[PDB]
Write a protein that binds this ligand. Structure first.
Ligand SMILES: *[C@@H]1O[C@H](CO)[C@@H](O[C@@H]2O[C@H](CO)[C@@H](O)[C@H](O)[C@H]2NC(C)=O)[C@H](O)[C@H]1NC(C)=O
Ligand SMILES: *[C@@H]1O[C@H](CO)[C@@H](O[C@@H]2O[C@H](CO)[C@@H](O)[C@H](O)[C@H]2NC(C)=O)[C@H](O)[C@H]1NC(C)=O
Lengths: 45, 48, 48
């Protein structure tokens, strides 16, 4: 049922360093390398 | 997933199965999918 | 490939747009980029 949607790769995952996002949202595949403030519990709905 | 000399390398393969639990038996080689020039220091990861 | 660019990148007052990293805990890996601007701790007594 397409539950697993992607991954985040990094070191600290808290906007002090750079992280990689590979996500599959309902419409596109998105690959980004930025300084993210990731949520403590990321998910899709 | 691999991280070598600034390249993040991805191989993959899809297979039809019919089971309920436990990773299945068998053999199938994965093929190159993409090779991203990101240039970062990955140490941890988290599933979405 | 490298060439001299005094005509383009030198200003009479002084051109301070161009920057470098003078401090890092460890050496970089090949084709790794570091943009982090974290106050480098030289000794003990953390910086906050
Ligand atoms: C999946 O992600 C893509 C890219 O982040 C979204 O596409 C963008 O949507 C915004 C909002 O309308 C547009 O302004 C951008 O131009 C779009 N970028 C494109 C099409 O490359 C897409 O909407 C997301 N899908 C869902 C369901 O949220
Ligand atoms: C890549 O990142 C890791 C984690 O941030 C670095 O390894 C850490 O290095 C510090 C000292 O610099 C140690 O105190 C930690 O115990 C290390 N943690 C791990 C998990 O190894 C590593 O030095 C970084 N590599 C580069 C080239 O910057």
């Amino acid at each position: 049922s397409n539950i697993i949607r992607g991954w985040i790769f990094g070191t600290t995952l808290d906007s002090k360093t750079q992280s990689l996002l590979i996500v599959n949202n309902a419409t596109n595949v998105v690959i980004k390398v930025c300084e993210f403030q990731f949520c403590n519990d990321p998910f899709l709905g | 997933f691999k991280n070598i000399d600034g390249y993040f390398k991805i191989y993959s393969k899809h297979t039809p199965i019919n089971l309920v639990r436990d990773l299945p038996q068998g053999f199938s080689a994965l093929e190159p999918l993409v090779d991203l020039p990101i240039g970062i220091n990955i140490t941890r990861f988290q599933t979405l | 490939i490298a060439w001299n660019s005094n005509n383009l990148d030198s200003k009479v007052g002084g051109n301070y747009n161009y920057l470098y990293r003078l401090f890092r805990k460890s050496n970089l890996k090949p084709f790794e980029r570091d943009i982090s601007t974290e106050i480098y701790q030289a000794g003990s007594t953390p910086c906050n």
